[PDB]
Write a protein that binds this ligand. Structure first.
Ligand SMILES: NC(=O)c1ccc[n+]([C@@H]2O[C@H](COP(=O)([O-])OP(=O)(O)OC[C@H]3O[C@@H](n4cnc5c(N)ncnc54)[C@H](O)[C@@H]3O)[C@@H](O)[C@H]2O)c1
Ligand SMILES: NC(=O)c1ccc[n+]([C@@H]2O[C@H](COP(=O)([O-])OP(=O)(O)OC[C@H]3O[C@@H](n4cnc5c(N)ncnc54)[C@H](O)[C@@H]3O)[C@@H](O)[C@H]2O)c1
Ligand SMILES: NC(=O)c1ccc[n+]([C@@H]2O[C@H](COP(=O)([O-])OP(=O)(O)OC[C@H]3O[C@@H](n4cnc5c(N)ncnc54)[C@H](O)[C@@H]3O)[C@@H](O)[C@H]2O)c1
Ligand SMILES: NC(=O)c1ccc[n+]([C@@H]2O[C@H](COP(=O)([O-])OP(=O)(O)OC[C@H]3O[C@@H](n4cnc5c(N)ncnc54)[C@H](O)[C@@H]3O)[C@@H](O)[C@H]2O)c1
Lengths: 262, 262, 262, 262
């Protein structure tokens, strides 16, 4: 099967990558970083995010696998010491496929609209400057949000920025996105919902400028200053990320291991 | 069609009930509180909850309709002044059916297990006394929770007790339950997740006593002191509540009307 | 100097107590549990709280010292292994005195008022039953609180129940009390401040029943069902607790050690 | 007495200013914006903040008075319609003076240190980029903070940015500053206190760079990108702001009026 390996680029990750390629050489099992069927990431959570975004135009043809050199593997299954076992398992085709939901972000201007795919989240802040937007859900005006910004998370994204903002952790079998507030202003004149909101597939959340059409918009690691924005639109993507697995490693066990104990 | 009406029991609600029965008399359209196909509640949110629990053994045969005399209609669609329009619409069969998910609670003892159905939530607190339970998700030990208690909410329940505890609001098309913490203790020795958790259908959350087997368990309005508890088990019910509707009144508009403005 | 020792009552604490008495026998240094100048607590945080409340009528004549057998010493300075060093230091008079603020609670009825002193906090919940009170600060109606209850904390109490409810941690040199909410209900009709409130000395916070005059009131470990309540009044006490110290052990280092690392 | 008036600069505020000057003309009562004893602000909360910072080098010689054209007067006492009554009261010397605490911020570089005074708060965020600082309190390493940033508030500042970040509201008679977290990262490897912290006078909170010495630092409305930072130091200022008052208008009533009702 066609595969490639991305490395964090430090000595540790590079050498692990070379050894895996050498091991894959004894199998069938072609290195191809143009049209891989398997993408292996070796590094931190950032390395995995880079791997995902490198191949976001062929997500339907790829199964992702992570080895984490950091603490701390939300998209890793594997430790550096387990690399030889993974080589043998991958070569044998000894795996099942699991899929997580993704978030579509559309930015409209005074055209051409830009579309982004997020594995963790997309956030919006001001470029300045007071942040004020109208929040429109399925064409109904829901609230005028004033504060620091807003975060829209995928289910797998809920353990990250979403969690820090008081959002719920959601099992990735649920096809949803979650909107959290950053430092909302609430007084007798200005009001927000002041709770995270969880949206199903096909629900559309639109942010519309009130002032003030410049925004700092993030998509996972990427952060861009967008000018002359008319709308930011959030919806669950029709696209999914696929993982190759190998052994049972339940989401809630992954949550336990990351936040409670070892 | 067979129907019944429950009233809050004050003069206002009783008279509205009598007038609706009188209006239903001009149609076809039989009063039957043993085997109703339509259950009409006139009162507050508590009146509606009582109506639901009065008929929880025939939820598959009933479509519920609420008129709210209070502020404040999370399960009401209707205002007292709209009662005549509702009579005509109901009599004509001019409605579509919408379903919300429900929460199953199982309490096991040193037998016979007790099972409860919740429309809003089920909560657990101590009878004393320090509250400490082991939280087990699909047979994996997730955390030892210390604090005031725990709340498990349906999607429609998320606007209630769940919201007050920092939980997310979830659209009821999502078949899920949400676990929130009450006053969790977190220090260098005791740790909880400290975020709400959202579980899909078929996931099972089990609370197991550590000490200390007596618990105050609530199911919607009902609150009971349970003794000699071995397990409390939470899962999304196979059963759903059905509503008769009539006109579009989106969940998010209902949320806006209840928390933001009019 | 006159002293006494309280023990948690397990074998470990009892034996440590006997050894300290034996060591104090070689000094001057009289055991007196009626009029002690020094009160030594050996046990958990609960043991220390019991020691404080045993002697709350002579707080001006006593300096408290704690040895913690638990994790986990918010009022302990000392570990069991350090007991011999403490014996020698105490006998020598080798200490400075530090004072923390306390909370006065007054419960008024349809007389005789009951007054309580808290080292950590006093809380109020319903006996049932919906909890609703009017919050009156220096005779001005501030809010109608609906929810689970309210917690009023001393500065040293802020690391306990207060912390779990989202309250700030306050240095005990600040003569204040802090009011936190438990599960406040906020919607378009019912509103609370939804933030902790910090009150200086001489400010008086009065809770007045709306319904519904029965309340479960806690003062540190003590929890009592109070009937026919007309008012609950909170204010910073004129009384303080005094500690004997011995070496510098800053409050913020104590916070670090308890919540961050070792 | 020497006075000046600042205006928001819209037609409404400008005309109110002209009328007050005309009214002050009938008294004694000299317009002097170099060395005023009374500074009158007409506009929003931003106008008042500008007035404060215009005269922060002569805070000991000035008593401030606000008229709010906005909603919404945390530093206003007065409404536009009350301007004539204020003219007469001011001219008569019919007032008492009230003082609130202020926050000193020191930014040290690889010299010359910059010092700022805040009436509401000072915040710190990254210029990029991951925000990571070591939090040092009175020379003791307290935590390594990872997240979006940190906010240090005065007592009067607690109703603003502090409130949005979950901070306590503190009565301004308390000489303190309060540190709140913005989106702190907490997992099994990274830990923060996860509660607001309230510091008395003379306590010093130092933020020290870990990476990564560029920071976006705000002081009230002012926001500056600081490069090559070695330390950010927070402490309660020896300086206070003085207000002229006129009638009793308690802080807690001001809080009620701003967040609860009218
Ligand atoms: N205050 C915050 O919680 C905060 C701020 C900015 C970004 N982030 C998160 O960091 C991610 C990447 O940011 P960056 O590349 O700029 O580096 P970064 O330094 O801002 O964040 C990297 C950290 O986030 C963790 N992380 C990445 N994905 C995660 C996941 N899904 N669940 C839990 N933790 C996860 C990594 O293990 C690492 O510790 C973003 O997608 C966002 O979720 C968090
Ligand atoms: N601190 C809290 O938020 C708190 C405490 C106890 C109970 N409750 C809620 O009250 C409900 C019934 O309690 P009770 O009968 O003892 O009376 P109650 O006085 O304790 O609560 C009644 C209030 O809850 C509101 N409510 C009911 N269902 C709701 C919904 N699904 N979404 C939003 N608000 C809703 C009603 O409008 C009413 O204002 C429970 O199911 C629980 O959700 C809330
Ligand atoms: N949900 C909660 O956070 C919760 C609930 C009830 C009581 N409490 C706290 O427990 C204290 C005593 O309760 P109890 O005797 O019923 O036993 P308990 O089991 O309810 O609580 C004992 C725990 O609280 C800790 N504790 C005591 N004083 C503390 C302090 N000032 N700062 C930080 N932690 C402290 C102890 O170390 C112990 O772990 C109360 O004064 C209250 O502060 C907390
Ligand atoms: N997310 C937030 O809560 C947020 C973000 C940035 C700034 N702020 C606050 O706004 C203030 C000034 O910001 P700006 O000039 O850039 O304009 P801005 O638009 O960012 O904020 C102005 C708003 O803050 C209110 N405000 C000012 N002082 C207040 C006080 N002490 N208590 C309660 N509300 C107060 C004003 O009434 C106005 O509604 C800052 O000092 C900060 O406290 C808040």
């Amino acid at each position: 099967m066609k595969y490639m390996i991305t490395s964090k680029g430090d000595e540790k990750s590079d050498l692990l990558r070379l050894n895996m390629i050498a091991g894959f050489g004894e199998y069938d099992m072609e290195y191809d970083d143009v049209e891989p069927e398997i993408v292996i990431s070796i590094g931190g959570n950032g390395t995995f995010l880079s791997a995902f975004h490198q191949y976001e135009e062929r997500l339907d043809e790829i199964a992702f696998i992570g080895i984490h050199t950091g603490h701390l593997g939300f998209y890793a299954d594997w430790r550096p010491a387990e690399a030889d076992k993974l080589v043998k398992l991958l070569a044998k085709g000894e795996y099942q496929k699991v899929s997580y939901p993704l978030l579509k972000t559309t930015v409209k201007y005074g055209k051409k609209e830009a579309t982004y795919l997020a594995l963790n989240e997309s956030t919006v802040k001001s470029s300045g400057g007071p942040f004020v937007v109208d929040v429109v859900i399925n064409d109904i005006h829901f609230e005028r949000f004033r504060g620091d910004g807003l975060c829209m998370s995928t289910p797998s994204g809920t353990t990250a920025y979403n969690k820090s903002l008081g959002g719920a952790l959601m099992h990735p079998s649920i096809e949803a996105m979650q909107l959290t507030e950053m430092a909302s202003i609430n007084n007798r004149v200005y009001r927000t919902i002041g709770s995270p909101l969880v949206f199903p597939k096909h629900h559309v959340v639109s942010l519309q400028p009130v002032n003030d059409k410049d925004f700092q918009i993030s998509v996972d690691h990427l952060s861009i200053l967008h000018r002359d924005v008319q709308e930011i639109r959030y919806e669950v993507s029709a696209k999914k990320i696929h993982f190759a697995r190998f052994r049972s490693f339940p989401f809630w066990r992954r949550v336990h291991d990351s936040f409670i104990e070892d």
